[PDB]
Design a protein around this ligand. Structure first.
Ligand SMILES: *[C@@H]1O[C@H](CO)[C@@H](O)[C@H](O)[C@H]1NC(C)=O
Ligand SMILES: *[C@H]1O[C@H](CO)[C@@H](O)[C@H](O)[C@H]1NC(C)=O
Ligand SMILES: *[C@H]1O[C@H](CO)[C@@H](O)[C@H](O)[C@H]1NC(C)=O
Lengths: 6, 586
């Protein structure tokens, strides 16, 4: 996984 | 059938499942493609609703085929297209602004535009959907990043509003991907990676067709009926892997293994399993049982009953009349497949309407050996010019309701489309008389960059001013798929009349393809580009090069020059012009 947008 | 939606209407109950869609119109597509959904209720962005309950698409089933409507604000509903005669696609070109669609985030590259992000998603083995942060996005770290995503269903696990971001789906189901399909079916081998799902399939064709429309399935294994363990016959395991390939292939026997084909989706049947399965009983929930004279009449009753997904027919093998058991299940598939009880089983054809129409089977009717008949080449058309008097000018192929694909060099000093006349289902030119009906060309789309036939960029479209009532005499051919670039066609056929000197009856002749390298040698003065393909060792300008592959016909080439009825003819390489054709048509 990548962290997604703030 | 009720294609339109319903301003502020909710259906009460039915709740089969709940998913998140970006819009009602797409929720309708999900409903249509789900094996049990008849109707739905979507929740729009509104004052009236908690932000959590937005983008909610609730798929429903009713036995009566409708539900009770309730006036409720922000709600859009809600019938599936199963009831419709219209064709249907899952292709959704919509880009969704200020919208973040959530799932497993797996590549996080950086991109030029929303467009190039979509292109990446479409070209990737794992991508269901994407989010792209525009230039205008706050965090400078994040602006321009294109992160790809997947889920179990293909739909997002959630949808939230987030300013300066754009979301959208893979366009594999618009025939736009350049991902190569692998058509090879590995026998006596199994695969051992993740097991994301399983159904009961009667053969490995069916198995691999189900892998194709299942969004999380990249490859599969089928344990045939002849397998050891009782608990595992007709078991279609649907697989995937982080890499996307099966890590390893075990010799392991009585099992076939293959790959998804989401990429070559149109041009192959997917939803349409017209075959019958003899001394085979499909287990599931019974819906009706009816008198029936043939197992064909059984299918037609299944197909005609919207809830029915599959059937078994019991021959009186007495008074002649069989029992037709109309059935359904949770997915679209039997819960158990049993052999040795004398039934004929198959599926609803209510599903073929989702398949691309140029994939429908061919009849059987004649081999002639040399000349054509009735409905042999339903896509081939004759192109008439009214100047100086009425004559055949070109061959063309039907590729759309409203479209012909043909050579640009055909239209040399044609001044107006109004000089043209397209005729379909024609054999003897003799058969054309003033009374004979024809299609009038609204428009000629020549490729920009076309100058000379031997320069190669030689391709034309005719938009017909009235659409084609599809018949046994008038059906389209399919465009080659971009995934199928590595395909080795071995059953290729040129059709036409003579075009100089013209033959009366439609000439048919099977011809071998010839490699570009190989052709280039025979052709001294002129360059043969990758945007051309060759063949040889009896048709017109603009005439089709038709190849049969897996009982489906493809338009591989269009006639362009050639010498002489021995040197190979040059052709326009249709595959290399697919973005283009799709561009100019939608
Ligand atoms: C064209 O029509 C039939 C085939 O449908 C053929 O037998 C006939 O000979 C042709 N007519 C001519 C050459 O006058
Ligand atoms: C819901 O309300 C009323 C009565 O049920 C009726 O006029 C109609 O069916 C619905 N829609 C609107 C706009 O009033
Ligand atoms: C996405 O990122 C990979 C590495 O994670 C990179 O090599 C590539 O440029 C991107 N994807 C492609 C071409 O599929």
């Amino acid at each position: 996984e990548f962290p997604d947008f703030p | 059938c009720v294609t339109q939606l319903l301003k502020d209407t909710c259906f009460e109950g039915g709740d089969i499942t709940t998913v998140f869609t970006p819009s009602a119109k797409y929720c309708q597509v999900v409903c249509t493609y789900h094996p049990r959904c008849l109707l739905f209720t979507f929740t729009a962005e509104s004052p009236s609703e908690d932000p959590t309950r937005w983008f909610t698409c609730v798929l429903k089933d009713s036995v009566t085929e409708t539900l009770p409507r309730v006036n409720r604000t922000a709600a859009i509903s809600g019938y599936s297209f199963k009831q419709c005669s219209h064709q249907i696609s899952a292709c959704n070109k919509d880009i969704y602004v200020d919208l973040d669609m959530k799932g497993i985030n797996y590549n996080s590259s950086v991109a030029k535009s929303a467009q190039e992000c979509q292109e990446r998603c479409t070209d990737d083995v794992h991508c269901h959907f994407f989010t792209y942060a525009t230039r205008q996005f706050p965090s400078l770290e994040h602006r321009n990043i294109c992160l790809l995503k997947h889920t179990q269903t293909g739909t997002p696990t959630r949808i939230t509003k987030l300013d300066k971001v754009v979301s959208g789906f893979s366009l594999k189901s618009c025939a736009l991907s350049n991902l190569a399909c692998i058509r090879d079916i590995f026998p006596n081998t199994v695969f051992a990676d993740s097991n994301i799902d399983s159904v009961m399939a009667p053969d490995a064709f069916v198995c691999g067709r189900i892998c194709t429309h299942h969004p999380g399935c990249l490859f599969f294994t089928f344990f045939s009926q002849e397998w050891p363990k009782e608990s595992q016959r007709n078991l279609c395991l649907l697989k995937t892997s982080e890499s996307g390939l099966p890590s390893t292939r075990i010799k392991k026997s009585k099992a076939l293994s293959g790959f998804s084909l989401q990429s070559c989706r149109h041009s192959i049947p997917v939803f349409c399993h017209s075959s019958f399965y003899h001394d085979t009983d499909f287990l599931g929930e019974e819906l009706d049982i009816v008198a029936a004279k043939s197992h064909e009449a059984c299918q037609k009753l299944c197909t005609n009953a919207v809830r029915c997904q599959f059937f078994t027919y019991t021959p009186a093998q007495n008074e002649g009349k069989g029992k037709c058991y109309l059935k359904l299940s949770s997915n679209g598939s039997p819960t158990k497949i049993l052999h040795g009880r004398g039934g004929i089983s198959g599926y609803t054809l209510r599903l073929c309407k989702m398949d691309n129409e140029c994939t429908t089977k061919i009849k059987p009717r004649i081999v002639g050996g040399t000349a054509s008949v009735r409905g042999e080449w339903p896509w081939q058309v004759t192109l008439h010019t009214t100047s100086p008097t009425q004559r055949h000018l070109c061959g063309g192929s039907i590729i759309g309701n409203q479209w012909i694909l043909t050579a640009a060099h055909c239209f040399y000093g044609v001044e107006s489309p109004k000089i043209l006349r397209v005729y379909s289902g024609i054999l003897n030119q003799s058969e054309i008389k003033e009374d004979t009906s024809f299609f009038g060309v609204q428009e000629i789309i020549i490729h920009d960059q076309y100058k000379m036939a031997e320069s190669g960029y030689d391709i034309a479209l005719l938009k017909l001013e009235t659409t084609v009532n599809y018949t046994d005499s008038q059906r389209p051919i399919c465009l080659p798929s971009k995934g199928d670039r590595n395909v080795i066609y071995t059953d290729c056929w040129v059709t036409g009349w003579g075009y100089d000197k013209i033959q009366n009856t439609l000439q048919k002749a099977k011809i071998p393809l010839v490699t570009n390298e190989e052709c280039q040698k025979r052709y001294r003065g002129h360059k043969i580009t990758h945007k051309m393909i060759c063949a040889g060792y009896k048709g017109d300008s603009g005439g089709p090069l038709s190849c049969k592959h897996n009982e489906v016909w493809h338009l591989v080439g269009i006639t362009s020059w050639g010498e002489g009825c021995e040197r190979p003819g040059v052709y326009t390489n249709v595959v290399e012009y697919v973005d283009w054709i799709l561009e100019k048509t939608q």
